[PDB]
C-alpha cells in the first residue's frame, strides 16, 4: 500500500526559506510523478508544483514561481519542496501528491493525496497581550426585554484567550465568539452576554479575559453609555 | 496518408462475444523479441524462419516471420535484423510460434541512449492521460510501438481483461510529418477472435523514425 | 477568484439526492476529463472520481459522474450523514500548464430546519475612539447550513477595505457562528451617518446598523 508523509513544515519569518520532505513507500517512487498541494486555513485547494517521473519536467503555479523549486531523490524515495522568501499568503497545509499512473507527461487530470499534510506558517507576529475594550449595551434602543454587552478582545498572539463573565458566575445567554486572524498577524475575538435590559442599572457586568502567553489577566467593568 | 475513421467503422467490443482475454494475451508480457540474428529457414515464399531463444522465460524456440509480399522476405532473407513483434501461437503449419513483420535492420540502427515517444491518450473526444514508452531504434515498426502502447493500457488502464473490455471502441494513431496511418484496437464482431487474421495488419512491416513519429489513441465509453 | 466554478454550497437531507456543477473554459474543462476530490471537515483531501466517472477503490456507488460540454456534474444518491465535506473539481489546465481546481462546494446533510443568522452589531467604544481607534464588530450566530457571505455599507455605499471575517464554525448546537470586524479611524466613524453589515444566508440578507449620533 501506496504511503506519503509529509514534514518540515513550523513557523517562519517572513522572506525567510523553508524545505519540506515528502517520504514516499509502498510503489517504485522513480516510476511515477509527483505533485505539490496547499490549502490555506479555511480556503480552497490550490496546487503548487510537478515533478515528472524522470525529473525533466518542472512545472509551477504563478503564485510561487520563481520562489519554490520541486527537487526529488530516488535514492532516499523523498519529495521535496524548496520555498524561498516566504510570504503570509504561503501559510497553508502542504500536501504531498503521486502520479496514479508510471511515466506520464502532461496533462495530469487527476493526482492521488494520501498524506495528513504539514503545516507551514509565515507570520511576523510576536506574543502581545491583548486591549480590552467594552461593548456597551444600546443606549435608548430597548428593542425589547432584554439586551447584549460584549468585550472586544483585541491584538493578541499567540492563541488561546479564555473569556468569562462575572468569575464565573454568569453563564446562561453567554457566547464567546472564534478569534479572527487579521492581516497583521494577531488575532481578535469577541464575547457577548445577553441580559435583562431591566438589570442594567442594578447589576454589574465584568468581562474575565485571559492571555496566559502574555501574562495578560484582565477583569473589565462593561457599563451603559450615557 | 490514411483517412480517419468515419462514424461506425470501428470495430464494437460490444459486438464481440468471445473472451477478450484472446485480444489481451497478445499484447500482454510474453512477446518475441531478438537482437542481431539472421534468417535460418524459409517455410513459404513471404516468410522467414528465424532460431529465436527465449527458453528460460519464454516457451518458443523457432519463430516463423510472415511477410506481405516476396520481396520484404527477399530484402531480409540474409541480412542480421531485429525481430520484435506479438506472437500468434494458434496454428500455422510450422516449440514453435508464427509472428508478422516487426523486422528491422540491425546495423546503424542503435541510439546510445533510449528514446521516449509521448502517447496521448483521447476518451470520448477528450484527453485522458499522456506516458511515455521508449525504444532505442532510430527505425522502429509501428508493431513495436503499438506493443508498447498497447501493454501500458493493459497493465494500468485495464484495456484488455479476460471477459470484455470497458470501452466501446478504440484506435491508435501514428503521425509522421503530416502523414498518418492507424488501427482497430478492438476485435472484429462474432463469438470467435482470429489471432493470426487480427495480426496480419502488421505483415507489411511498416516502419516509422523515432524521432519525429506522435502516438495517439482514441477510446471510446460504452 | 477561482479558475473553476462550481458554487460555494449546497444541502438536502439523508436518503436524498444532490448534484455539484463544476464548470471551466476550452483550455481545462472543455479539453481534459476532469476528477473530483471529497474533503471531510477537519481532514485531508482525497480523491474521489477520476476520468470524470471513475471511481477508485473503496468509494461507493452512490457517487457518479457526468460530462455535458464545458462543464461537469458530481451526483450523490442516498445521502448519508458522513457525506458532509467540501468537494472539489479539478484538472489540467493546458493555457496555465497547472492542475486547477474549483473554489469548493460545501456539502451539508440536513440534520434539522435551517434558520436564518441572527446578528449584532456594535459600534466603536468609546475607550477605543479615546485610543484613536475604531473597530465595528458583528457577530452572526445560530445560522444552518454553515454558510453565509458577509457585506459592510457605509451609509450606502458598499465599503471593502478594513474587512476581517472568520470562516463560520460549529457551536454546540449544531448551528454556526462567524463574526466580521470593519476597522475605522474615528474620522471616518464620525463622518458618516451610519455604517452596517449586512448577512446573506440561504440567499436572503439580514442587516443592522450603527449610527454614531
Known amino acids: ?226 | 496518408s490514411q483517412p480517419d475513421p468515419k462514424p461506425d467503422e470501428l470495430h464494437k467490443s460490444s459486438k464481440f462475444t468471445g473472451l477478450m482475454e484472446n485480444m489481451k494475451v497478445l499484447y500482454d508480457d510474453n512477446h518475441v523479441s531478438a537482437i542481431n540474428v539472421k534468417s535460418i529457414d524459409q517455410f513459404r515464399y513471404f516468410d522467414l524462419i528465424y532460431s529465436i531463444k527465449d527458453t528460460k522465460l519464454g516457451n518458443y524456440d523457432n519463430v516463423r516471420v510472415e511477410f506481405k509480399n516476396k520481396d520484404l522476405a527477399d530484402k531480409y532473407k540474409d541480412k542480421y535484423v531485429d525481430v520484435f513483434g506479438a506472437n500468434a501461437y494458434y496454428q500455422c503449419a510450422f516449440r514453435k510460434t508464427c509472428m508478422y513483420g516487426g523486422v528491422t535492420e540491425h546495423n546503424g540502427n542503435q541510439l546510445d541512449k533510449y528514446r521516449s515517444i509521448t502517447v496521448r491518450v483521447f476518451e470520448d473526444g477528450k484527453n485522458l492521460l499522456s506516458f511515455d514508452v521508449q525504444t532505442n531504434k532510430k527505425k522502429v515498426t509501428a508493431q513495436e510501438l503499438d506493443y508498447l502502447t498497447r501493454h501500458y493500457l493493459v497493465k494500468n488502464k485495464k484495456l484488455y481483461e479476460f471477459n470484455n473490455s470497458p470501452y466501446e471502441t478504440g484506435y491508435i494513431k501514428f503521425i509522421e510529418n503530416e502523414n498518418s496511418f492507424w488501427y482497430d484496437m478492438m476485435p472484429a464482431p462474432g463469438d470467435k477472435f482470429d489471432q493470426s487474421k487480427y495480426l496480419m495488419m502488421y505483415n507489411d512491416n511498416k516502419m516509422v523514425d523515432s524521432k519525429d513519429v506522435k502516438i495517439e489513441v482514441y477510446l471510446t465509453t460504452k | 477568484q477561482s479558475v473553476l466554478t462550481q458554487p460555494p454550497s449546497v444541502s438536502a437531507a439523508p436518503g436524498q439526492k444532490v448534484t455539484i456543477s463544476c464548470s471551466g473554459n476550452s483550455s481545462n474543462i472543455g479539453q481534459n476529463h476532469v476528477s473530483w476530490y471529497q474533503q471531510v471537515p477537519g481532514k485531508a483531501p482525497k480523491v474521489l472520481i477520476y476520468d470524470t466517472k471513475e471511481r477508485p477503490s473503496g468509494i461507493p456507488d452512490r457517487f457518479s459522474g457526468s460530462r455535458s460540454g464545458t462543464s461537469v456534474t458530481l451526483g450523490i444518491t442516498g445521502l448519508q450523514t458522513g457525506d458532509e465535506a467540501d468537494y472539489y473539481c479539478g484538472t489540467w489546465d493546458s493555457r496555465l500548464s497547472a492542475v486547477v481546481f474549483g473554489g469548493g462546494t460545501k456539502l451539508t446533510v440536513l440534520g434539522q430546519p435551517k434558520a436564518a443568522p441572527s446578528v449584532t452589531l456594535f459600534p466603536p467604544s468609546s475607550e477605543e475612539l479615546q485610543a484613536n481607534k475604531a473597530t465595528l464588530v458583528c457577530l452572526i450566530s445560530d445560522f444552518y447550513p454553515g454558510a453565509v457571505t458577509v457585506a459592510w455599507k457605509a451609509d450606502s455605499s458598499p465599503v471593502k477595505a478594513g474587512v476581517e471575517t472568520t470562516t463560520p464554525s460549529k457551536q454546540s448546537n449544531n448551528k454556526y457562528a462567524a463574526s466580521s470586524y470593519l476597522s475605522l479611524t474615528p474620522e471616518q466613524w464620525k463622518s458618516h451617518r451610519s455604517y452596517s453589515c449586512q448577512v446573506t444566508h440561504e440567499g436572503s440578507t439580514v442587516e443592522k446598523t450603527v449610527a454614531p449620533t
Not at chain 1, 505539490?36 to 525533466?56: C, N
Not at chain 1, 445577553?194 to 501574562?215: A, D, E, M, R
Request: with cysteine.
Open chain 1, 1 to 226: 500500500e501506496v504511503q506519503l508523509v509529509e514534514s518540515g513544515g513550523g513557523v517562519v519569518q517572513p522572506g525567510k526559506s523553508l524545505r519540506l520532505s515528502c517520504a514516499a513507500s509502498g510503489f517504485t517512487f522513480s516510476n511515477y510523478g509527483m505533485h505539490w498541494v496547499r490549502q490555506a486555513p479555511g480556503k480552497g485547494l490550490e496546487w503548487v508544483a510537478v515533478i515528472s517521473y524522470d525529473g525533466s519536467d518542472k512545472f509551477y503555479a504563478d503564485s510561487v514561481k520563481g520562489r519554490f523549486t520541486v527537487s526529488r531523490d530516488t535514492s532516499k524515495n523523498t519529495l521535496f519542496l524548496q520555498m524561498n522568501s516566504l510570504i503570509p499568503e504561503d501559510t497553508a497545509v502542504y500536501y504531498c501528491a503521486k502520479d496514479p499512473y508510471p511515466s506520464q507527461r502532461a496533462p495530469w487530470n487527476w493526482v492521488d493525496p494520501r498524506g495528513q499534510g504539514t503545516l507551514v506558517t509565515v507570520s511576523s507576529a510576536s506574543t502581545k497581550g491583548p486591549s480590552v475594550f467594552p461593548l456597551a449595551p444600546s443606549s435608548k434602543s430597548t428593542s425589547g426585554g432584554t439586551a447584549a454587552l460584549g468585550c472586544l478582545v483585541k491584538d493578541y498572539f499567540p492563541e488561546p484567550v479564555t473569556v468569562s463573565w462575572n468569575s464565573g458566575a454568569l453563564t446562561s445567554g453567554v457566547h464567546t465568539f472564534p478569534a479572527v486572524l487579521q492581516s497583521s498577524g494577531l488575532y481578535s475575538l469577541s464575547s457577548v452576554v445577553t441580559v435583562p435590559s431591566s438589570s442594567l442599572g442594578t447589576q454589574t457586568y465584568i468581562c474575565n479575559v485571559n492571555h496566559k502567553p502574555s501574562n495578560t489577566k484582565v477583569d473589565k467593568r462593561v457599563e451603559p453609555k450615557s
